[PDB]
Each structure stands twice: as structure tokens, then as C-alpha cells.
Amino acid sequence: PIDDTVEGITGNLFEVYLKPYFLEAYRPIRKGDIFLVRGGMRAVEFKVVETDPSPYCIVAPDTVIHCEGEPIKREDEEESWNEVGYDDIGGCRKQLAQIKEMVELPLRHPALFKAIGVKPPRGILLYGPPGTGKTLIARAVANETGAFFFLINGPEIMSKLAGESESNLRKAFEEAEKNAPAIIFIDELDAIAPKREKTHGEVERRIVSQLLTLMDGLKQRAHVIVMAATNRPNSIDPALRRFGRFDREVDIGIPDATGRLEILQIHTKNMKLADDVDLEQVANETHGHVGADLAALCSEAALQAIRKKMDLIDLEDETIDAEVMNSLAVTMDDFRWALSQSN
Amino acid sequence: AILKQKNRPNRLIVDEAINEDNSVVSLSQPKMDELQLFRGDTVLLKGKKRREAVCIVLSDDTCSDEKIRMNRVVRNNLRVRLGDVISIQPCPDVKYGKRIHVLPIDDTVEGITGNLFEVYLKPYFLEAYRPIRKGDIFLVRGGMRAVEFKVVETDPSPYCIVAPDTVIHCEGEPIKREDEEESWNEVGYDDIGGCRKQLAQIKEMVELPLRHPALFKAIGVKPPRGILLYGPPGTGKTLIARAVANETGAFFFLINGPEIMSKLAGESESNLRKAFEEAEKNAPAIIFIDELDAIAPKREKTHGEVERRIVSQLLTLMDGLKQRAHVIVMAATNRPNSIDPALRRFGRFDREVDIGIPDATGRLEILQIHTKNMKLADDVDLEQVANETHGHVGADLAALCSEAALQAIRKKMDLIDLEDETIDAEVMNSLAVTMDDFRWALSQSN
Amino acid sequence: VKPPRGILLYGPPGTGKTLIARAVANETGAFFFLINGPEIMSKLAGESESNLRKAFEEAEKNAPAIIFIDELDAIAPKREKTHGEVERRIVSQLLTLMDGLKQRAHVIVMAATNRPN
Numbered sequence A: 001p002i003d004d005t006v007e008g009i010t011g012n013l014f015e016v017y018l019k020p021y022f023l024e025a026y027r028p029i030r031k032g033d034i035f036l037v038r039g040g041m042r043a044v045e046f047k048v049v050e051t052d053p054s055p056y057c058i059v060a061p062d063t064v065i066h067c068e069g070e071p072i073k074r075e076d077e078e079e080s081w082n083e084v085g086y087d088d089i090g091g092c093r094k095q096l097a098q099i100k101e102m103v104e105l106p107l108r109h110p111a112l113f114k115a116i117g118v119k120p121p122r123g124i125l126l127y128g129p130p131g132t133g134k135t136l137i138a139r140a141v142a143n144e145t146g147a148f149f150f151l152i153n154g155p156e157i158m159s160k161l162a163g164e165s166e167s168n169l170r171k172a173f174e175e176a177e178k179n180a181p182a183i184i185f186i187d188e189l190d191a192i193a194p195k196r197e198k199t200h201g202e203v204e205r206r207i208v209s210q211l212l213t214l215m216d217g218l219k220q221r222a223h224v225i226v227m228a229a230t231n232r233p234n235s236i237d238p239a240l241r242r243f244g245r246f247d248r249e250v251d252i253g254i255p256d257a258t259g260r261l262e263i264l265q266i267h268t269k270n271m272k273l274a275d276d277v278d279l280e281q282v283a284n285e286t287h288g289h290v291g292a293d294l295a296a297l298c299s300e301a302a303l304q305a306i307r308k309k310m311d312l313i314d315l316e317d318e319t320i321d322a323e324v325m326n327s328l329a330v331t332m333d334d335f336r337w338a339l340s341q342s343n
Numbered sequence B: 001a002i003l004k005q006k007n008r009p010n011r012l013i014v015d016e017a018i019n020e021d022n023s024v025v026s027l028s029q030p031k032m033d034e035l036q037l038f039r040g041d042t043v044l045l046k047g048k049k050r051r052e053a054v055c056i057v058l059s060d061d062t063c064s065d066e067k068i069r070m071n072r073v074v075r076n077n078l079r080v081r082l083g084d085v086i087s088i089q090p091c092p093d094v095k096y097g098k099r100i101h102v103l104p105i106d107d108t109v110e111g112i113t114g115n116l117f118e119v120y121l122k123p124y125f126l127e128a129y130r131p132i133r134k135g136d137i138f139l140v141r142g143g144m145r146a147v148e149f150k151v152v153e154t155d156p157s158p159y160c161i162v163a164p165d166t167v168i169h170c171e172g173e174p175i176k177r178e179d180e181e182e183s184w185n186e187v188g189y190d191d192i193g194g195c196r197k198q199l200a201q202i203k204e205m206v207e208l209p210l211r212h213p214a215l216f217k218a219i220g221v222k223p224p225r226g227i228l229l230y231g232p233p234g235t236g237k238t239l240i241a242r243a244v245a246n247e248t249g250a251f252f253f254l255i256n257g258p259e260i261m262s263k264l265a266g267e268s269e270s271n272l273r274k275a276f277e278e279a280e281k282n283a284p285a286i287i288f289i290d291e292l293d294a295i296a297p298k299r300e301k302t303h304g305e306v307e308r309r310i311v312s313q314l315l316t317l318m319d320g321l322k323q324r325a326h327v328i329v330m331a332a333t334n335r336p337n338s339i340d341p342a343l344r345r346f347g348r349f350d351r352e353v354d355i356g357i358p359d360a361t362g363r364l365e366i367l368q369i370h371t372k373n374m375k376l377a378d379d380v381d382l383e384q385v386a387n388e389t390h391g392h393v394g395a396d397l398a399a400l401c402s403e404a405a406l407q408a409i410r411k412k413m414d415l416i417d418l419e420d421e422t423i424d425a426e427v428m429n430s431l432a433v434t435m436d437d438f439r440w441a442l443s444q445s446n
Numbered sequence C: 001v002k003p004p005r006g007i008l009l010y011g012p013p014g015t016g017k018t019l020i021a022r023a024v025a026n027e028t029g030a031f032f033f034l035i036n037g038p039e040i041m042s043k044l045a046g047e048s049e050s051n052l053r054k055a056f057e058e059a060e061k062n063a064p065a066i067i068f069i070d071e072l073d074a075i076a077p078k079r080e081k082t083h084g085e086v087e088r089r090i091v092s093q094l095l096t097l098m099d100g101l102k103q104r105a106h107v108i109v110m111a112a113t114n115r116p117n
């Protein structure tokens, strides 16, 4: 096992995870592979450290599986446990395909731009209501392209004494440059760069100004894309749209029925769902909901299902166990219960 | 092998009292049948930390089969919270006591003079045949307060029935309140009325995080971490948060909105961060933010840049909450529109509860809570009071109950001063609050 | 039981609100501490707040006591009519002290203003 992926799990991991993964699947595997198994409301990772015959084989009913040894450290090994990817994003294929194509050359073929005199986009603005996956998108793109990611949180910047706010912005831009190819994501940009109509006082003006200066200095630091998120165009300072600052915009709207379904599948992929769970129904009835609503919904049904079973658990003096967690089905009733609350 | 049945039928989930008495527990009739217990039997209850208690069992027609209704006194004696499990068995062993020793808990009798013991203990035990256990702490109400006693010795030991013939000894050093686990002056769900649905929601919301925290190191699901309570002033939002902390055994840290804003800048922000660090170090914990709109108003209604910094500092701390296990932040305000809508983002205040104004039945319940330490004359009709206080909230009715108690005391202070009289436990406990006293309070304007 | 701890007197100027508070102190043998609204606000910030807290500490040490706040609206106006952040701090300091009053026996705070609004 990879250590961090099994922290907080107790019981026979190996029985609980490995058996249903391999059972009658005849998976071919290679020495050195890392693989991911889902269940018990989490995901677990294992390394294949040895195989016989070597260095590959099929894992068949007769194949014995040894798990004794020192757990593998997650830092020594290149895997994606808990790293957001495009497979973690649903319901917005077109816009993700645009962002992809936009950052392809700069992030994946950076050395190109020392050879040619064309300017890549350097600033992309993502619009859409809250909970629509704008942070997730930026992170996914960094991970999926191997780029460095630096998050700037809008509120965090503004929570500082003046000069500190400005020093922290500049530090962010210096760091992305030193680790480039890099994406700088500015969460809640409108906290930092509102319009002049809605500005109050002069530290606030200084800080929008500092941001625009840094955006203008971006063409001089290769190969940094700045992505930034806000509720709508009208919030923010329109000077941010100037050529060579945020010169590209993407509208991340609200998912439709098919997108919601996809979102629900993503947010239930670590769960055991009973046969009566009809995610298509759930998707059909959640009109107007966004990705954060449906993740909240999935968490709420999982937790209702656990509360049901904690009583029975405490009645028999039971401790919570990998076996317990993995056998525990979330049912349609659990989802119906979450769908019927108001909050 | 060393066997013992698992899934025993005498293990029950503890649930709230409907009948408020220190000596009674309630099961469902089918459970009693199954366990061969009968109405009025003595039962021995086992809880956490090897604690035991003795009680009278009754049938309740709303108790679920797997549950037991017990009041807060008994729970503390057992070291259980609502939702924990106990075991129950017959105790037909229990004899009329020859003698018992009790001591008062010190803070609970500070400021009372006269024969406490006569005034409190006699009416508590008189012809009630209460079973009691050595080590029990119990609460007695009267004379506009509540008093606590420990049972330090019993004969026969370690339990008996307190019967007419039972002698009660009270000489000794008073017990210190710090050495002892009881709820004098601690707000609980029994101190809250008229909002059952919303309290049941909050309960279920915080159940797993506060009561089963180790769960969340095992699973990758996110619990709610921020709950916002809406409703007019005086509606018990602070009381609710406190009750939930107490009833779940969680640490409570109150942040007062005005107090934060009364500081020099940087201090306000340092004080917020300190609050969040403290709750983390003592977690499971609830942070309650009283008058949140003092701290995090909307940008339309902001004035200047220390005020922006301070909303910003709060949102940053809320975002850091997923990194500090297992802290719920509850916060209170007059309505959604007051506050900064960035507080509603996923992973900040992602749950809202509307604590509205109680109805007639809720008011009645509120009035009963706020008169439980008083002697009320027979003519006191709390249902009338409840019917006529349309639109009032919990703070209005508590004020009303205080105002009637005080009017009743002013009536009697004159007669008291006419005879050179000093105020006494005896005086306070015999002093009835009457309907006239409540009618008088109902007829003022303030 | 909780006694009232704060009483607000409304009415036009010249209607004897200061006189009433003083009369009540004298007639009950209570200590009287007058806080003048304008006087508080005439100070550097921090001083205004220190002076409020000092007033409340003094009434507590000499209790039973009445604190009378003359021209309260100089000190604690509505948020619509507030200007700037020393003014917010000072209303805030007052509300904090009022909340601390249940912890200091036996202090009534009386305060005077032209109207609720």
C-alpha cells in the first residue's frame, strides 16, 4: 500500500480492497505499476513491487497475493491519489476543450515560444455562478499538464495589512515564474479587483493597480498562464480585459441533466450504491443545481446512510472498520432524504 | 473460549425525557414486555465509565423500541449523552433505606441562607420513594433557583429507596462543583422550547462530526462545517449553539461580534485567528459567532478598509476550517440579506437554519421552562399567557417571567420590611407567583 | 431571576431625563456616574473607549450604582448614519460593556435620547 492512501483505515485492507479488484477480472499487471481501488468512501493505492513470472503476469484465481512489507511512501512515487483531473470534472466538455487547446502550447511545449514571435494567451477568466468548478478546472488543468499551480485566494490577500497584500501578490507571481511552466489561479478575483464604481478608498485602489501591473509584467515571465475566477464580467475592473492581461474569457454555466448525471457519478465513485439508487432520477430532478450542490447532496446521503448504521453499530458495541465501511450501501432512501431537506 | 451475547436486547439508545423527573426512565411497552419489566419496577442502569444508576421504569407510548427516555440528571450520573447506549436490568434487590448522607454542591447553594436541607430535600423526597445510588448527583428546584446535592453514602449500600423512615444526614464539607460532573446552570435541550424541527436538524447535522470524529479520518466524505442560524433577536440562537455543545460534550468558544469590532485593527483579526486556533486545539468544538453581521456585512453596507479586512480575515479562516478537525462554526444573524454572500460559498457556511417565532404551543413550553424554579399559585394559567402573547419570542417570555417574579417579590418585600424580616430560603420557597403578578407584567409597556 | 439592567429614556430635549436619573440615584442612595456623549466623542480614539470602560469599572466598584448616558445618540447612532471606523469601534465598545453588565452587580445603566430611531 501507499501510506497516505491507507491512513485512517483499519481492518483487513487487503481482503476488503484487493479481492474485489482482482476477483475473476484477469487483470494483467506489471512490476512497478501503481493502481487505485475505490470503496468504503475512499480510494486506496497500491504498488506492484514484484511479480512471478517477471516482470508481468495476469492476476488469476490461482494467483497468490503477498502484502507483507514496509508501506510505500507517497512522495517517492508518481500517482494521482487526491489530485484533481479532468475525470473529476463533469458537465462542461466544450469549455474544458477550449481551455485545453488554449494552454496546450504554452504549458506543454514552452520551448516553442523562444523559437517564434507569436504571443500566446496569458490570462484566462472563468465566469459562472459559485459552486460551478472554476477552482477545480484550474487545478485539473495544472495537474493534467504537469504545470506548477499557485492559488491566490482573493479574501486572503485582502485580509492583510496594505503593502503585505501587494507584497504577497508579487511573491506569487515571482514563484510561478521560478517554477514555470505554471498556472496562477486567482480565486474570487472580484474581492481584489472590483470596478472603480464599487471601490472604497485607496489601499483598495492600490491593490487593483498592483494586480494590473503584475499582469502587464507577465509577458516578460515565461511561461505563466494566469487563470482567475469570478461571478460575472460586471463585477470586476474592465481594465483587466485589456490586450495582454485577461485577454480570454470562458463561461462555465450550469450543468444540464446529462452533466448532472456525470457529476453525481463522479461524486459517488468511492461509495457502494444499492441497486435501487437511480442517479438518472436524481439528475432529472435537480434542475438549476450546480456541481457544489450535487457534491453536497452526495455527501449528505452518505452521511445519512452512516447515521442509520451507527445506531445498529453502537447497539452491538461495534467499532468502524474497513469491512464495515465497504459493505455499507448508500440507498435511494438516503438520497431521497438528502433531496428533501432545506439548506 | 470466553463467550457473551452480542446484540443484547437490553442495550438502548438514550433519548430525551418527556417526563422530567430525576427518578424515572421510560421504555416502550413492547421493550418492557420483551425484558419482563413492569410499570413502577426498580431498574438498574449501566452507562459509561463503570457508572450505574437506579430508577423507576414507566411505559411511554412515543418511545421507540430501541430507545430509553432519561432526563439530563440521570444522563450525567451515567456519563452518557443523547445518542449513547446504556444497559438496563431489573433491580428487585432494592430496600427501604435506614439512612443516607447527602452533601450540597457549593456553588449551587451560594447566596442561600436558612435551612436548605428542610426547604429543598423534604419536598423532593416526601412520599416519592425515590430510589437512589451512592455517588448520584441530583437537582432540586424551588425558591427561584436550583440546588444540587451528591449522595455520598447510603444504607443499605450502594442503593436504596428513600422512604418516610429514611433518615437523611447533611453534615460535612460541601462538595466542590469542579470535582463533579453535573449540569447546574448549563444550557441543554430541555432549556429550549418551541423549535423541535430545527433543533432536530442541527442535531443530525453535528452528530457525526462531534460525537464520532474519528470516523472522518477513515472516510473521504466532507461533513458540514458551517451552520448559519437566522431569525429575529431573542429567538434563542445563542442558547441553541450552547445547548448543542453541552449536549454533545464539545468545546464551546463564543465570538461576540461587537466585541471583535470594538478592537484596534489587527487586534480584531488576531482575536478571530486566536479563536479558531483554540477551538482546533480543544476539538471536537463549536465556534459560535454571535451577531455575525457586526463583523461580516455585505459590501454595499461596508465602510472603509479595516472593515473589509475583517470580513476577509473571517472568510480566510472559514476556508482554513476543512484543515482543522473537527470544528463546526455556528453563527447567528437577523437575516440572509444582512451578511456578505461570500459566506455562503461551499465549504464556509454551507448550511442555514431558520429559527422562527414560536407558536402557541411553543410559547407554553417556553413559559414552563422559565418558571421551573418558581413556585406558581394554582390560579396561574400558563396556557392563557401563552395564548395572548402572539408574536412574542423566547426573550420576551423570559423577560415576562422575570418581571412577574419580581413584582411578586416587591409585594412581599413591604410585608417583609414591616416585620423586620430578612430574606430566607424558607421565605423564597413559600413565596408564590400568582396570576395577578403575570397579569401585572403583561400590562406594562417596555 | 434577572433584573432589568438597562433603561432607555425617550423624549424631546429639556424634558428632565438627566434630572430623573439623578433623582433616582439620590433617592435610592445609589452611586451616580454621568457619561456625557459629546465628552466621550471629543477624545482621541482609544481614549473614548478607555473612558467608557473606566466608567463601567467605577460604577461596579461603588455599586449599587446608576450609569447615566446623556445624549447616547452622540455615541451609538445607527449604522446608516455612522461615518468611519473609530465611530463603529465606539458603538461596539458600548455594546460589549452592556453585555458585561450582567457580570457586575448591581449596576443599572440609564441612557437618554431624542427617539428610538
Ligand SMILES: Nc1ncnc2c1ncn2[C@@H]1O[C@H](COP(=O)(O)OP(=O)(O)O)[C@@H](O)[C@H]1O
Pocket (backbone or CB within 6 Å): A088, A089, A090, A091, A092, A129, A130, A131, A132, A133, A134, A135, A136, A137, A229, A263, A266, A290, A291, A292, A293, A295, B346
Ligand atoms: N463540473 C463539476 N464536476 C464535478 N464536480 C464539481 C463540478 N463543479 C463543482 N463541483 C464540485 O463542487 C465543488 C465546488 O468547488 P469549486 O471548484 O470551489 O467551485 P467554484 O470555483 O466555481 O466556486 C468542487 O470542489 C467539486 O467538488
Ligand SMILES: Nc1ncnc2c1ncn2[C@@H]1O[C@H](COP(=O)(O)OP(=O)(O)O)[C@@H](O)[C@H]1O
Pocket (backbone or CB within 6 Å): B191, B192, B193, B194, B195, B232, B233, B234, B235, B236, B237, B238, B239, B240, B332, B366, B369, B393, B394, B395, B396, B398
Ligand atoms: N426557544 C427558547 N426556549 C427557551 N428560552 C428561550 C428561547 N428563545 C429565547 N429564549 C430565552 O431568551 C433568551 C434570549 O437569548 P439568546 O439565545 O441570546 O437570543 P438570540 O441569540 O436569538 O438573540 C435566552 O437566553 C433564553 O433565556
Ligand SMILES: Nc1ncnc2c1ncn2[C@@H]1O[C@H](COP(=O)(O)OP(=O)(O)O)[C@@H](O)[C@H]1O
Pocket (backbone or CB within 6 Å): C012, C013, C014, C015, C016, C017, C018, C019, C020, C112
Ligand atoms: N419634569 C420636570 N420637572 C421640573 N423641572 C424640569 C423637568 N424637566 C426639565 N426640567 C428642568 O429643565 C432642566 C432641563 O434639564 P435636563 O434634565 O438636562 O433635560 P434633558 O435631560 O431631557 O435634556 C432641568 O435641569 C430642570 O431644571
